[PDB]
Symmetry: C3
Subunit: 660 residues, 3 copies
């Protein structure tokens, strides 16, 4: 009843799924009740062969059957699923649905300005994906190649990804907010032979540069042989390099509306998605084909309760894993329409999300708490203008959801009639790890609830490294066996992969997160233990920001840490020591970060100090910057172990004077 460790769970009223959820459910639920979920979950752990075997044969269409469901171990980093099987991602996301119902909506595309919105059916999607795949084929793209995509969140980004996967190549989607430098680093690490981009973008009604940044990056990308450019704005002033750049519309018009998909092995790579960790350089997280697709389909169907009649609106960007799995692969695998929103939640006004839901009668809505906090602050008044009664599942992703935000989400968006799915997962997991199945698992606001099929979650004592038995516990969140959609490697750097996920806690997968498990088995995410900073849902590398600040010849040393933020969840604070206007130089360093990484990595604040605290070796002690960036300087303790203990006073004074 009472918890001594997991205080979040004390006196928390369990929240059953509202009765209206089942009234709006088009068919019988995919799972009967929570007891059937526990029985199925236990088979997915104890007998993954008999559990995932049948599900893989139901939900995916195979070109060659698989002979072995599961292989390898975490400790040896050789996980594999559905071995010997062959399939194609674009066939399972497009072809098979187009043959069955070519006129069914596939991509419900809401542009930055609604006047530019349009809907592609599955038949439309097959023809356009076939044409792009025909261009890439004519250019020499083939199984084993990588192709970069630098596109906003619109139809062309989806078509590019599916066209690449149709040939057996792996796509590497580069979020449209990345700078030229970040584009360069990602294209070169993957040795991409081609790039798919557009001339310009539309964001909040403003024209954004896209091709311009690519040209800047491509000067140092010798592997890129040809570029496909979509005329998003058709601006005649956008230059194309003769012999390298070609127009989407011109080249697709040369090839037919059907191209055979290329069968690939279950374990052939489907895509690279570069991610930021505690290292200084982005790591290309590699996902398999069959296992990743199955996880996407499984979680989308069972956690969100998706039926053929439903319509999913994932308010994410394909530049991130959320868009990968739940705006593209998840929905299209199940054959339902997915809403691809190119704009922002604030344009033309803070009701846009709800105008879209009402316009298309979306049944499922998936968004990050950062957006919920913004609409609670600036757009609560807009909600009453829209009919949101078509909704029944409300998802939350990317970061902790406050109990308060949970209630606001539940009341103002769901009218206290929808099921909320707080989905915990990460880029490397491919799909949901811990989440309340819609209509099945009752909720505790702020808790992700139970682990999903194939996810044998555990807590590890951070002092002893041994697994913690029993409930009312806390520790490092780890997973005891691999699962179908687990990332298989870091591109051309499997040693970093092993050192990051498998070697820290041998026999386990290290999520990088801490968590707690209450007496009912519900998991409560406590945050990253590895000091990875997550700003507005964007996973960031503090080391990458430190490197950017140092490129400025004026900076001698820099240290970046994360702190709580009422708006972005977390914010990065940069401490800079100069060699030697203070407000002017502070703006110069912030712009330096925007140029090298991107606008979304810029520090919320730059604190200029005379000296950083260090060890007797000379290493910077960021632990002191963290306790100061929060009002916990009284917890720094004995600092006589520092070589420069006198610097601590200046750091407390500088932070108090310059943080604002």
């Amino acid at each position: 009843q009472t918890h001594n460790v997991v205080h979040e769970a004390n006196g928390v009223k369990l929240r059953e799924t509202p009765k209206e959820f089942f009234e709006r459910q088009p068919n019988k639920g995919h799972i009967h009740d929570v007891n059937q979920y526990k029985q199925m979950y236990e088979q997915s752990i104890k007998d993954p062969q008999g559990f995932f075997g049948p599900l893989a044969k139901e939900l995916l269409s195979w070109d060659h059957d698989f002979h072995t469901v599961k292989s390898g171990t975490l400790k040896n980093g050789d996980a594999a699923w559905f071995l010997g099987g062959e399939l194609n991602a674009s066939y399972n996301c497009v072809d098979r649905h187009a043959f069955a119902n070519p006129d069914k909506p596939a991509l419900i595309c809401e542009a930055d300005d609604e006047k530019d919105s349009h809907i592609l059916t599955y038949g439309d999607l097959l023809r356009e994906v076939s044409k792009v795949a025909g261009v890439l084929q004519s250019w020499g793209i083939k199984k084993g190649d990588t192709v970069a995509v630098y596109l906003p969140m619109n139809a062309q980004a989806i078509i590019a990804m599916l066209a690449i996967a149709r040939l057996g190549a792996a796509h590497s989607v580069i979020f449209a907010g990345f700078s030229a430098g970040s584009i360069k680093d990602r294209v070169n690490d993957a040795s991409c032979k081609a790039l798919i981009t557009c001339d310009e973008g539309k964001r909040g009604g403003r024209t954004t540069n896209i091709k311009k940044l690519c040209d800047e990056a491509l000067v140092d990308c010798p592997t890129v042989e040809k570029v496909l450019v979509y005329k998003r704005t058709n601006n005649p002033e956008i230059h194309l390099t003769e012999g390298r750049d070609y127009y989407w519309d011109v080249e697709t018009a040369k090839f037919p509306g059907y191209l055979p998909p290329v069968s690939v092995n279950s374990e052939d790579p489907l895509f690279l998605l570069y991610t930021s960790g505690s290292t200084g350089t982005p790591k290309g997280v590699v996902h398999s084909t069959a296992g990743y697709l199955l996880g996407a389909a499984l979680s989308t169907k069972y956690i969100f309760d998706i039926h053929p009649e439903d319509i999913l609106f994932t308010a994410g960007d394909v530049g991130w894993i959320t868009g990968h799995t739940y705006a593209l692969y998840g929905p299209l695998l199940l054959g339902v329409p997915t809403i691809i929103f190119e704009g922002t939640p604030a344009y033309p006004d803070y009701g846009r999300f709800w105008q879209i839901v009402e316009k298309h009668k979306a049944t499922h809505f998936y968004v990050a708490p950062t957006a919920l906090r913004l609409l609670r602050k600036a757009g609560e008044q807009e909600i009453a203008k829209y009919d949101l009664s078509s909704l029944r599942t409300l998802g939350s992703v990317g970061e902790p959801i406050s109990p308060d935000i949970w209630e606001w989400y539940n009341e103002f968006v769901g009218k206290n009639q929808c099921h909320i799915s707080d989905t915990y997962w990460q880029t490397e997991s491919g799909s949901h790890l811990i989440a309340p199945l819609a209509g099945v698992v009752p909720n505790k606001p702020g808790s992700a609830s139970y682990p999903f099929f194939g996810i044998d979650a555990a807590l590890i004592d951070p002092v002893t490294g041994v697994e913690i038995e029993g409930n009312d516990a806390e520790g490092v969140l780890a997973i005891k066996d691999h699962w179908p959609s687990m990332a298989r490697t870091v591109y051309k750097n499997h040693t970093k992969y092993m050192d990051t996920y498998m070697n820290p806690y041998p026999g386990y997968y290290f999520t990088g997160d801490g968590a707690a498990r209450d007496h009912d088995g519900y998991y409560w995410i406590r945050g990253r233990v590895d000091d990875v900073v997550n700003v507005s849902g964007h996973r960031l590398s503090t080391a990458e920001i430190e490197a950017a600040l140092i490129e400025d010849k004026k900076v001698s040393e820099a240290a970046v840490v994360g702190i709580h933020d009422d708006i972005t969840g977390q914010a990065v604070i940069a401490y800079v020591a100069l060699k030697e206007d203070s407000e002017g130089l502070r703006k110069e360093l912030v712009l330096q970060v925007r140029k090298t990484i991107g606008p979304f990595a810029a520090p919320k604040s730059v604190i200029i100090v005379q000296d950083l605290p260090k060890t007797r070796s000379g290493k910077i002690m960021r632990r002191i910057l963290r306790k100061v960036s929060s009002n916990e300087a009284d917890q720094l303790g004995d600092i006589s172990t520092l070589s420069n203990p006198q610097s601590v006073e200046g750091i407390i004074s500088a932070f108090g004077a310059q943080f604002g």
Copy 2:
């Protein structure tokens, strides 16, 4: 009586002669003209249930197909037997070599009969594997294109099959093309290799073959290597070192068997140019069309011998001098010479020599033997023939009767086959021993071909019989060309955009009160 189709007024139906059935080795494939319409209507109304089983009957698959038909004419995305895999050379050679290795395959009649030979299916498999082994050794792989510039002899048939054995597309270039026309076709397809010969023989005279390639290859950088056959063995012929190699020298280095390479149903099988436009044909669709029409329009049985007096530089040789016959495991006669060499009885010496059962030629040759070789027909025995075919042109009702009595002796069936390179196989033709004939008429459309007439002025389909207009088809068919290489726009503007929802044949035709279609020529 007809008010529109003036060609139809007073034309007596010409039932197939009774002697056509005495010479049939087995019960015909279709009983009467009535059953043909029960099969035809199903092929229009239920293409999935009609062509699906036929595809499994006539072709051998390495991977089953999951969808029989996809796409529409309006969107130029037609596809057949999606998901399936197969290999053209396996269906034309391997599977018959295993069953009967010694059965004849290529009955080769050279320019001089003194150089005529024959290749059994066992021989053909060994010769195609060795040439394919050469190409595989050179780096030729699935997705490449290989040009052929050869006369009408064994080497051309082997070259096409060897190229398809690796899953590459062969682009055949008629041996009577100029170096310019050669350069244009090779560069459009970016062919990595070329198969030709030192020099051919056309009616006694020797023709410059390699000399024309060399003049053209100087503008074809994509060509890495050339395989040269010794048709005459002339030493004065120059082979550029490091590029040109001898057929016999390279094939001697490789074994008599090479595994075929599986290709998807919709992987291109060949480019064939008509600025020249490269007509691209799929693999499964085209092959099925070739075998179906060969089986039902000509009434080909395993015991039959087809003599298509055409050249593989054109579609007629593609479909009915190579693929059509060999898919059915029957022998086909590859004639390199001319109808006048040694004299105007060569066609008849060959028919008599090999007891050919089927003959297939264009009316252009009929007008040459009508006005020069009408007498040589009686010297030779033409009693083996059952079906006589016309192709390429409209056959004058004059020439139809001449072709019937002089060659057919009033005892054979005549089928006026109408079709284009873009159709892959026969569009409208009378079936042997099924469809009665009207001299000069193509008669009824074939399975899966939903013929229609369109008023050119309004663009609206003309209903009811006794009408004329632009000939168009209402749905795509398995052997329909899928695109024009690297130029699908020209493909849409030519065939699909003139009349959306239809296939523009480029011809004008008329349909009389009996449904018999009369081809009135190009528009």
Copy 3:
């Protein structure tokens, strides 16, 4: 009593010792010699119904085959399991790793025992996947060839399987070959990559490996990249920037699983050079022969442990140190060293250490151990042994008795296995526990091997027993080599054309009244000109009897009309007619050379007829080559 096969007179048949069956883990795969003949007769008369089921039993298929057997010897187009697809590394590694990943796979005994180690099947899958991942990232793919120049250790086995995992064909180059011998083999195969090590250790001595490769690679432009294993980690071994990369550095970048690539049954699995000729073996047929012979001739069960004391540089290591044992899922002992280092007991210390049940070695090694180390054998417990194999050469009845007594303690079955590189697997051998032995005889032909004796003058088959002649085979078999790389005409001229309708082993043999075969010496020069078998050595002697000739060299070359033609080069127009009559008088009318070319001097080494053959078709004194090319044209 025998009037022809004198080896068989008074030879006591030697039954399999009772201890053999006591140590046998399960019931034997064949009950008795009577059951063996029933199976053998089906393998000859009905290979479709015999090998079909066995291929489905012993091999794992990615695509089913539609035809068990195709082609003929006469046409050199033999093929088995047509339309089938599989992967060699999947059948040797993956499927066993899934079933029991901790089962030992490669028991590796290094030159110095301190460096020995054991790889499980799970270990092997990870290491093969990683190397295959390095090669894949380098662009190696189906249809490529990859050279291996490695000692007999884990890296050689891993390299071969990693190459086969991508559908490329490996070409193993014995680590003792010189730079020149490496050059010829890499260029004939146009290998795109090479896998080697910095230095080797053999008998405690450091051998140069990379140094010889660098020397050869300067003239091997097809090699794009080299993978170098740190066997000694000698810091002075130079690596060329942009071409050479370290095994450990690159494998660390890639995951422990990589999908295998399906290949056709008849796609080449490997080239093995022997001018060196690249013997090409198929995939499906070769693997089936390896598994079949390993299982039935050696009597291999899942519980057994095989020690083939051979080198992967030769076919013996290919078939019976790697493919045979791993296909059946058993551990195989990979010995890097010599039988004398650190001492002459090493072979027996290894058998005792790992309780090997099967031992396979060539008589050359047995003679050495009998001469220098007989005393050491009794120091070790060899009671785990049950099958003793002999390969590569005749085994004397005396050496057989010594082998049987001192190694086998008169308790083991001996399998004298006759075969050759081009046969892929055993041709004639006594099945362990089934066929009783006659010392020195290979006994009965194996499944699918229709052995016969043919008269070497007429090529006609010899009926009945107590006979001797050319050992030939009447039909092809699954593991028969398919060609010589890019030189199928030499293949045909060597194996299929000398005795049309037969496969020519090059060996003589005799068949006694019990049907046992006794391998005799090698057959001499056989040139077949319009059916007349000729001896080039016999013609040279006749030309030399002419006092005008100082030296003479006769060789054979392909001929489109007469099959083969002999060309005589003479070192000293009218005299040319005098020499031809001399050959007709002393040898026979049809033995005259097609042409006699008079030269100033013949090539020699220390006669190099390999040069004369390549000249008649289009060391020491290299300048003489110019004059012979002009003389042949004159």
